[PDB]
Write a protein that binds this ligand. Structure first.
Ligand SMILES: [Mg+2]
Ligand SMILES: [Mg+2]
Ligand SMILES: [Mg+2]
Ligand SMILES: [Mg+2]
Length: 211
DNA sequence: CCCGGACCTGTGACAAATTGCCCTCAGACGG
DNA sequence: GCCGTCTGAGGGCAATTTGTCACAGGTCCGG
């Protein structure tokens, strides 16, 4: 009953910094690209508003600001870096935007991760979108999984801001909040435990199930 | 023994950013 | 052919959430 996003693990594990609104758009580009290709995609205001339950007005504000914040953003596959866009976005018709994704990214978009788009569209924090994508990469058909993520690798790939290198801030402003959104906003039920070595906490062990 | 120091934890404050809302007004279209 | 309506491109808001750092309070190490 809703679009099935699929993506290469290389994207699930890439290093980048995107907002919620930018990540939302990114799912549709990947959907458009995959159903086929030169890299030219399109986004309609009225569709976006309906997909994510926004008004037309607030949808228009989100697309425009997301689009101008792509400039200078870069993507790293672990390493090799690429720009997302190679030409500015533009509007041929009122309510329509046309975009030029870097055609060299295609092979990185299409050993894979998959999720239905309704699973993530109510999540607000972009780091919690990242965590839920990384967990889906390990999900079994039946709907459960278990994975150990290294703390430095979380910090390197999700590009956490610098103060989350102090572990008490990492717990309070990233881990607990994102485990709670997932438990409150997705059909997943998530638990975790800390792996320690000496005084330092080194990994987080995630277990999850489906409702 | 106890010190100062280097680690670690959690919490109170405040700053910066983001959220869904609200209001204006001209574009595109059809009847 | 004009206008009424549906859109969406602008401009804003206060309430919450996210990002930063000082200080309280624990351990062990080496002198
Ligand atoms: Mg918004
Ligand atoms: Mg004393
Ligand atoms: Mg006390
Ligand atoms: Mg002390």
């Amino acid at each position: 009953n809703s679009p099935r996003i699929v993506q290469s693990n290389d994207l699930t594990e890439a290093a980048y910094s995107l907002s919620r609104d930018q990540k939302r758009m990114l799912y549709l580009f990947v959907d458009q690209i995959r159903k086929s290709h030169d890299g030219i995609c399109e986004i309609h205001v009225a569709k976006y508003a309906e997909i994510f339950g926004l008004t037309s007005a607030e949808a228009s504000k989100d697309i425009r600001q997301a689009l101008k914040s792509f400039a200078g953003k870069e993507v790293v596959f672990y390493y090799e870096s690429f720009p997302w866009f190679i030409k500015p976005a533009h509007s041929p018709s009122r309510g329509l935007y046309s975009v030029h994704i870097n055609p060299y990214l295609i092979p990185f978009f299409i050993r894979f991760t998959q999720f239905r788009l309704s699973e993530t569209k109510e999540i607000t924090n972009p780091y919690a979108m990242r965590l839920y994508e990384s967990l889906c990469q390990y999900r079994k058909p039946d709907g459960s999984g278990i994975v150990s993520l290294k703390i430095d690798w979380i910090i390197e790939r999700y590009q956490l801001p610098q103060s989350y290198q102090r572990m008490p801030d990492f717990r309070r402003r990233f881990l607990q909040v994102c485990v709670n959104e997932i438990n409150s906003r997705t059909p997943m039920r998530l638990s975790y435990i800390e792996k320690k070595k000496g005084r330092q906490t080194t990994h987080i062990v995630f277990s999850f199930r489906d409702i």
